[model samples]
Target: PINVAIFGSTGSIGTNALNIIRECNKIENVFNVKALYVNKSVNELYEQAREFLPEYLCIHDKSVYEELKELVKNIKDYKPIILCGDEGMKEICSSNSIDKIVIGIDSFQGLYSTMYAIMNNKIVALANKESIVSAGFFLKKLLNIHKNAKIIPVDSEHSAIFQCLDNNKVLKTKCLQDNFSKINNINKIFLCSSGGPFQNLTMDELKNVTSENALKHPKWKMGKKITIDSATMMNKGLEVIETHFLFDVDYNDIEVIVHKECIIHSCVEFIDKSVISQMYYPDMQIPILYSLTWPDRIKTNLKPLDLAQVSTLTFHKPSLEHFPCIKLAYQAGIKGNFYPTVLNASNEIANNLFLNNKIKYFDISSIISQVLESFNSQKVSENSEDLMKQILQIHSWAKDKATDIYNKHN
Candidate 1:
């Protein structure tokens, strides 16, 4: 049984992962729940602890320590050891018992814990796009230094690419880019986007969009922030940068398209111009299942895709005029160095500002574009002994700069 440690146990991805564990274990008992870590959400964590009965429970929000302790008292069957703060989560991640660590924490918050997990030589099932998108170069170094450290992407698009790439030995153990370089026949990669709910909206229509409208994704049910990211098409851009890092593919070889159906999560083209795409029912569980059982397929009760009733699969090139976020991502990704870090940080702040209805949906990309332009003329060092520190500095600067711009305008 593969022992699992979830880093963001209370979020949408974390809960779905827990569901995957429950469903798979019921079939063959293939997985053992080791630990669950959450940022806050005490009630939700308490419920998960009661059901999974993990060895450890960690709360990053220290202010809720006493409240979480009180809530855990309600769990009758098992009282697992409860820990508080980032240090506590790090402790659980370093445990020798866990075979896989799921980094589901949001934004850049999971950066330190993820680094710590790799430092201890753990296999990471990565779902935190921002963490990887913001710090891919730094993470590449860590994976190189610690031979045991590796990442299996948990996002649907990435998992699809990893599955399609088809190198069992490389998929299971080594970094995708580390071993992918050996394969020369591959030609191109296609990153599919659902086009989001606001894909067809005009600039006039987009100005009046509420958080509720942004959260209404046409395909996937995700956390609020990510849903907003999808609406802005920033998630696609972030995934582009992430894909570049994961497979070490060139920016020119990668392209994004509007696949409204979302059945084909993602695909790749070979040298012969043949395309291999992974099709699913646009559910998170499929990718989560694959990440947990790498190079091995497991039986699940989930229904398979049916193309007859859901016919007329369509695809078109994404418009930069409507979705500027993707353009921003490619720009940051190609620029390299500290630019992607700044992009991720600024987007995170801008997304939140939009979430609170503090700014229009349009301002999300505008603010990010302004920040990048501000740093565009400046020279930033990509080569440094402490890239993590440098990236974090960029992160803070971008957040402050974006906030200042928002305050000045609003």
Candidate 2:
């Protein structure tokens, strides 16, 4: 049985992963849930721990440690070691017991756990894009040091791109050899977006839109942060940065297109101009499952896509005028260094402000843009530790700057 630990175990991705594990075990015990970690959802963590009966359970919020411990203790004959906060998360990721670590955490906090898992040479199924967007340079450097470390992308578009690139065969071999240039047949990467709920809305409508309006994503069921990002098209921007890191594609080679159907997740073009696309029903579980059972397709009851019934699939260019977040992301990504870190941190803070009704909808991108414009360039380090420290400092600085901008706006 493959031993697995799920960070952010109470969120949408984590819950879906748990469901997949449960369904997979029905046929045969294929996976062992070794550990579970959550930020603040004590009840959900307790629920998961009771059913999976993992060897360890961790809650990031230290205040709820006693509550979690007490709940776990009441379970007859089942007492998993209870851990709390960042140290506990580190222990779980660095532990020798777990074989795979599913990083479903939504924020930049997931960066440390992802790095720790990689340092210990664990298969990381990464769902958190912020971590990669903020610290991808460091992760790339770390992967070079730990040759055995593998990151199987969990996002639908990235998963589609990975699949199109020979199911990561080329990626694994070439990346392990520390030569990304060897795996070069790709011409362009077409990252498809559903364009969120406000695809048809004008800039005038966008200014007056509320968080409730932004949260209503038409295609995929996701957390509030990502859903809001979708409405603003910032989610696609983050993916642009993520794809650049994951596949070593340059900003010029990647293009974002609005595909309303979302049947085709993403596409990759070869030098010959032949395009290959990975298509499926818009279900995150497909990508999640693929990340778990890579290089081998597992038997599952997921509904197969019927293109005839779907009838029409249309594509169009995204409007950069309204969705300035995408443009901002591209600028930050192309600038490199501490720019992407500041972009991610400022966007995270601004996104949360909009979600909490502290700021208006359009203010999300405005805050990010202002924050990025105010940032000063810093010296970059090649050392992973030094890079991590520098990125965190920039992240903190960007968040504060974004907050100050938000306050002025409000």
Candidate 3:
């Protein structure tokens, strides 16, 4: 059995991963749930602990430690070692008992866990884009140092791109070897987007759009934060940067197309102009499952995608006028050297403000743009420790700058 640790176990991706694991176990005990970690969702964590009965349970919020303990106290014939805070998360990531680490934690906070996992040479099934978008430079550096550390993207678009690049090869033996030279023949990578719930709304209509409206995504049920990003198309923007890092694709070679149907996950064009794409029913579980069981296709009861039933497929150019977040992301990604970090930090803060009704929908991009403009570019350290400190500093500074901008405008 493959021993797995799920960080951010209470979130959407984490929960879905657990569900996939449960289903997989139904057929055979294939995956061993070694550990589960969550921020503050003690109840959900406890519930998972009872069912999975992992060797270790960790929580980011230390305040909920006692509560989690109390909830898990009566689990019959189970004694899981409970851990707390960042220290605990690091321990779990670096644990020798874990074979794979599923990082589903939102925002750049997941960066630490990702780095730790890489340093410890764990197979990282990464669902958190913010961490990669923000710290891809450092991650690439770490990957060069730790040759065995493998990062399998859990996002649907990235997974599609990975599959297309891998050419259906069982990746366990030939996993991203030779510094991802597999993509040498790639010409262009097309990232597909559903264009969110407000793809048709005009700029005038966008201003009055509330968080509730933004949260109502057209397809794919996700966490509140990412759902809002989808409505704004910032989610796609983040994916653009993530793709760049994951596959070593340049910004010019990467393209975003508004595919309203989302039947096509993503497409990759070869240098010979041959295009290969990965298509499936728009379910995140497919990508999650792929990440877990890479190079091997596990049989699941998932409904196979019937293209005939959904006969129409359409594509359009993304409107940079309304979805300025995509433009901002592109600019940040192209700039490099801590710009993506600042972009992610400001966006996270601004998005949270909007979610809490502290700012308007448009302000999310506005805050991010302002924060990026205000941030001074500098040569980042090549050393991992120093680079991490610089990234965290920039993240903090961007958050503060975004808040200040919000306050001044109000």
Candidate 4:
């Protein structure tokens, strides 16, 4: 049985991962869920523990630690060990019994868990874009040390590329500097975007879009922050940065296209221009299961894709004018260093501000753009060993600056 831990077990990805686990269980796949970790959702965590009854349940928020302990005590069937705080999270990530880790945590906060999992040499199925965006350089070192450790992408696009590259493809794990080498025989990678809800909106329509309206995603159901990102196309931006880290492909070789069908998750082209793609109904479960059962395909309960019902497939270049955040991502990614970190940090703060009605929809990108301009002079050295120190420093500085910009707008 493959023992797995779902970090950030209360989020959308975590919930879907649990659903995948449940399906795997019914089929008698040797996939056992051993642990779950959450930040502040005590009640949700308690409920999940009752069902899965993992060996360990970790809550990162210490203030609610006692409350969680008291609540879980009421469950009569299970007596799983409860742990709290950063050390608690670290312990679970580094558990000897955990053969694989599902990284579903959000934002830059998940960097530590990713580090700990790698340090302990556990196979990682990663979904945390911000962590990879910021710590690609740091993680490359960890990947080198843990040569046997595998870091597979749980994102649908990356997962599609991995499968398309071939069952016998040579995949390497390394941090890409500006002069990084690419996989041989690969010419280009196409990352598709659904163009979001505001894809066809006019300038006037865009001006009137509210956060509530932005949350109505036409494609995939995702977390709040990511749903908002989809509207502004920032999620696509983050994915671009993630693609760089995950595939070691140069920024220029990667292109983002508007594939409204959302049928073709992602595609890759060989040197001879032969294209390979992965197609499925828009569901997180497919990729989640793929990551769990790498180098193999298991029978799933999901319905098969029907090309007849969706007879047409269309692709177009994204409008840079409508979705400027895409360009910002390219700018940040191409620059390297602290730029990507700052871009993620500033955009995250700006996203929160916009979500809470503290800033307008347009102000989200505006604030991030301003912060990026202000902090453009500050670049992190790639050779720095203390990645945590560098990431935290930039994160703090960017948050404060972005908040200051929001306040002035108010």
- When summed lDDT is taken over every stretch of 10 residues in candidate 3, the lowest stretch is 170-179
Output the better candidate (2/4) by lDDT. 2
Candidate number that wins on lDDT, 1 or 2: 2
TM-score for each prediction?
A: 0.94, 0.95, 0.95, 0.94
lDDT of 3 by residue, 1-410 (tens): 78999999989899999998899889887899999999899988988999999999998888889888899998989998899988898888778999889999977878889889888999999998898888888888788888888898898998998777754433433233333524357778899999999889988998888888877645887888888889889999999999888877778989999999988999999888999899998887888888888767787877888989999999998999989999999999999888999989998888888888888878889889989998888887967799889888888998999989998995
CA lDDT of every candidate: 0.84, 0.87, 0.86, 0.82
- Winner of 1 and 2 under TM-score: 2
Candidate 1 per-residue lDDT, tens place, 1-410, comes to 89999988888889899998898888888998899998878888888888888999898889998888898887777778789887787788778988788888877988878888888888788898888888887888778888887788898998988888767435444554554634634577899989889877887887788788887644787888888888888999999988888887888989998899889999988778988889988899888888889868889988877889788788999888878889999998998877898899999899999988899877889999998888853354456445667778788999999998999994
lDDT of 4 by residue, 328-410 (tens): 98998898877888889899998887777777777888888988888854554545466668778887898899988887775
* lDDT for model 1: 0.84
What clash count does candidate 4 reach? 0
Q: Count of backbone clashes for each model?
A: 0, 0, 0, 0
Each model's Cα RMSD: 2.1, 1.9, 2.1, 2.1
Off by over 4 Å in 1: 74-77, 169-173, 176-184, 376-385
lDDT of 2: 0.87
lDDT of model 3 at residue 278?
A: 92
- Considering only N, C-alpha and C atoms within 3 Å, which residue pairs clash in candidate 1? none
Displacement of residue 16 (Cα, Å) in model 4 is 0.5
